[PDB]
Amino acid sequence: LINTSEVAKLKLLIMNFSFFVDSYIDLFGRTSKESLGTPVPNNKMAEYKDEIIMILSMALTRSSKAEVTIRTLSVIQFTKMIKMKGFLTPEEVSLIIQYFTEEILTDNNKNIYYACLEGLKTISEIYEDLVFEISLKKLLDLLPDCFEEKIRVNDEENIHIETILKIILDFTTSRHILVKESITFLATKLNRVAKISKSREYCFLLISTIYSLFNNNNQNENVLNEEDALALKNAIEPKLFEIITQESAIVSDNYNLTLLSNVLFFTNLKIPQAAHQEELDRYNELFISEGKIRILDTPNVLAISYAKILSALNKNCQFPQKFTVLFGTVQLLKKHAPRMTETEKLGYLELLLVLSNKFVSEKDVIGLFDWKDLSVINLEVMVWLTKGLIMQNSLESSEIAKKFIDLLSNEEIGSLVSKLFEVFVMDISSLKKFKGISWNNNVKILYKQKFFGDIFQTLVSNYKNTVDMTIKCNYLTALSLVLKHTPSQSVGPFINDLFPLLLQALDMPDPEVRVSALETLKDTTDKHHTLITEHVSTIVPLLLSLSLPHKYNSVSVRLIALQLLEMITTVVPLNYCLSYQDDVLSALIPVLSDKKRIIRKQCVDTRQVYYELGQI
Amino acid sequence: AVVTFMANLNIDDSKANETASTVTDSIVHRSIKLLEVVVALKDYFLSENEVERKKALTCLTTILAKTPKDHLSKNECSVIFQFYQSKLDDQALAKEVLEGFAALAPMKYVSINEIAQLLRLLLDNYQQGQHLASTRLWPFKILRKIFDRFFVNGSSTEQVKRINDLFIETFLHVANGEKDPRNLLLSFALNKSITSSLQNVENFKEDLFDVLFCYFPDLKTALRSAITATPLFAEDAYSNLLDKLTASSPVVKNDTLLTLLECVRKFGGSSILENWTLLWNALKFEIMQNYTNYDACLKIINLMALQLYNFDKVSFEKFFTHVLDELKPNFKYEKDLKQTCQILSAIGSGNVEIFNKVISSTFPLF
């Protein structure tokens, strides 16, 4: 233990100290958040504490930037020495935090970069106020008033404007004070860069960072507690409407508005129920009954947020105006549809779904039915309501499903119903039995499978009982858009009758149905073999056309065609596979030479495996 | 009564019940010496050596179970203070504490402070069911008895409404560590009762089947009666049961057909009226697939048709017309007469009216 900056001497000193810290730990203890300053009675390391502190400080800082192992071991031993119960003063950990931050902003060397990240994160989990005061506040201060500037750490070395955002995303993931003050300051800077500056990507990144920090805490339910999330909401929400008022980038860009909706959903998801109601009432008064914004009278983009508001506000609390808002948004969708923008219409549809699954009972939906008008808006309303009904698992939804099948036999309206029929089966990301919340909705996970069992059979019978372009295309599109969201391996009995439409669904523009049907043939050929053996002479050139470059064959689509070609060649015996070697070897040349290279690598592998299977 | 002191000191001699009988005789003699012997035992197991502590604790638990006469609520809570400290310190003495818990849970001498301190700390320090065969065997007992004492909805939860939700995840805490079949049966029965007798399980449902599925592979009919106990497994039952129509091994297929039998029986008529079409599709697929599974699925079809008929004649009529529309060429022709004829044979064996329906629908065909 002698002062030295040489790589060998200092490295051996540090790796020796790595064992003396362990001996000291085993003899005495380790940190607790209550023992952050309490030292152990006596030892000889206290007499050497100044020397080890100095050698570590000169090993990390006042050292050349080319030291990867030296600085990594330096920050590691800094962190390990911090890990002792109150043996280093808050001044020492403050100096260590400053060293970590300076050496992480100066050097891009991802060794020292990520090692300093690890040290700062461990300090954050063992020292809330210390890291929040030295590192976090400084990092929040580096960013300037205007977007797209060079974050000048010092005279020469500078980091990007997004580097501060990335560092904020790194830690504060479990530090209550850090994360709350970070959310507040990021909201402040969002407001500032929208008001005194004119930026879009910075506002988007800031609101996305707010969303991510809210998510990292709602995953723990304790980093922001119920009351902590309520207080941070009361801090950020007026700061969010004041940036709503100015054009900003959250109103100018509807994507940042959706990020704000996610932030509101997360911060109202962690709200005490006794404080939900009034807030709900406020929302129930602000959006429906009164207020400047009226979702029931004039379409507006911010309405989408209210959807995430209603799924996040309490259900089993007095929400008297739930049927009237459903009727009002139905009327607005019927009337204002040409002047409704995409964000407005999507938000009102999500609001329809939220009421259907959460607040309004099934009687309101069934009383809202009107099948006499075969209009696009009417179909949208009925589909998005009976989607929550299916999510509620009732007769109507299942019987309305058959009604939809029948109406899908129509020429010009059955086609629209078939192309829109995906809506019934999708994920929600806002209304499921999420961890934490239990009053979210009338959630039923069995909706997908049930809907498939109610749809598939009739669809296939109709397809085999149909002649023309339109109605058969409708049946194929409907069954495909239903099977795409339901897991293919969870629907087994339907596979056998699905195989004809399964083979049919391999040629159509949407790569979504393409990936879905390719997955379904994968599962089928894994399970079924008689169908595969009897239908290989038909499937193989279809997979070949899938593997060909096309206006509809994405690079991923061609990759999946390669995967299915491999799977069907493995399952089908060698007799038919020998007859289908040269075609795959020849019609793949734009796939092992396309724009992406995973496509190229996997096409090379597909060609090689086909060649070795044919030659043997 | 010198018998008091001789028993209190000879329990260390590993006399087991021989000195316990003398303790009971002493309690009969002086009628006040039970508290004296338990408090003289309080520091008697305080010694660190294993024999002293374990033999004092086993007799303490035994005579505490044998002393429900004079036993106060706050004194009760104080009694489990040493139970918890022994749980915290070491094992191989915590087992006696486990029989003590499984003995004190049934009795009504469980205070509000006791039920709360239990539901918090019996898994705070002890983390029941995590270690050792018996030290994981008895926690299921103690939680079963604390459920069946007053937390079970025999008197509802007018003063134990706090433990409802948290009992869900404290039973989930004691899981994934018990492998002997007895603990498996215990977990199955606990899920069965904690869904059906207990209220407000819907707020925290579908997670109680996690321990069962982890313990699910024999003597497994307890899980099967659990998944059919209450309509709360409705959303759960189909969630697995339809998948079990696709199962390969016929034993689980038959057992799950029995479970669907009790399900259709005790899920009212609304759920069966909801799922009649998908269930008939799946069961006809299994008819083509197959106490075997075939008689079980015929009984499934029979009970499902009967449930629709008794619940709503409209639903049973929709079922009957769908079955006729799908199978009428089979009956009229000479193709697939066995399966379809057996299907309507089971259907018509429900009542006289359904039998007349089946006869008038099939006899004119052939």
Residue numbers in the entry:
A (entry chain C): 414 to 1029
B (entry chain F): 9 to 225, 242 to 314, 338 to 413
What does the article say, verbatim?
To address the preferred orientation issues that we observed with the Vitrobot-prepared cryo-EM grids, we prepared grids of ScMet18 (SUMO-tag was cleaved) using a chameleon, a commercially available piezoelectric cryo-EM plunger that is based on the SpotitOn plunger developed by Carragher and co-workers. To our surprise, the data collected from the chameleon sample had tetramers present in addition to the hexamers observed in the Vitrobot dataset. The tetramer contains 2-fold symmetry and was refined to 12.77 Å. Both the hexamer and the tetramer have similar overall dimensions and their chains have similar curvatures, despite the fact that the tetramer contains two fewer chains. As a result, the tetramer is less tightly packed than the hexamer, especially around the more exposed N-termini, since its protomers are shifted away from one another as compared to their relative orientation in the hexamer. The protomers of the tetrameric state appear to be less tightly packed than protomers of ScMet18 in the hexameric state, and thus the ScMet18 tetrameric state may be more prone to issues of particle denaturation. Notably, residues that appeared to be involved in binding Cia2 (R1010, R1013, R1020) are buried in both the hexameric and tetrameric states of ScMet18, indicating that ScCia2 cannot bind to ScMet18 without disrupting these higher order oligomeric states. In the other two chains of the tetramer, these N-terminal residues are mostly exposed.
Here we report cryo-EM structures of the HEAT-repeat protein Met18 from Saccharomyces cerevisiae, a key component of the CIA targeting complex (CTC) that identifies cytosolic and nuclear client proteins and delivers a mature iron-sulfur cluster. We find that in the absence of other CTC proteins, Met18 adopts tetrameric and hexameric states.
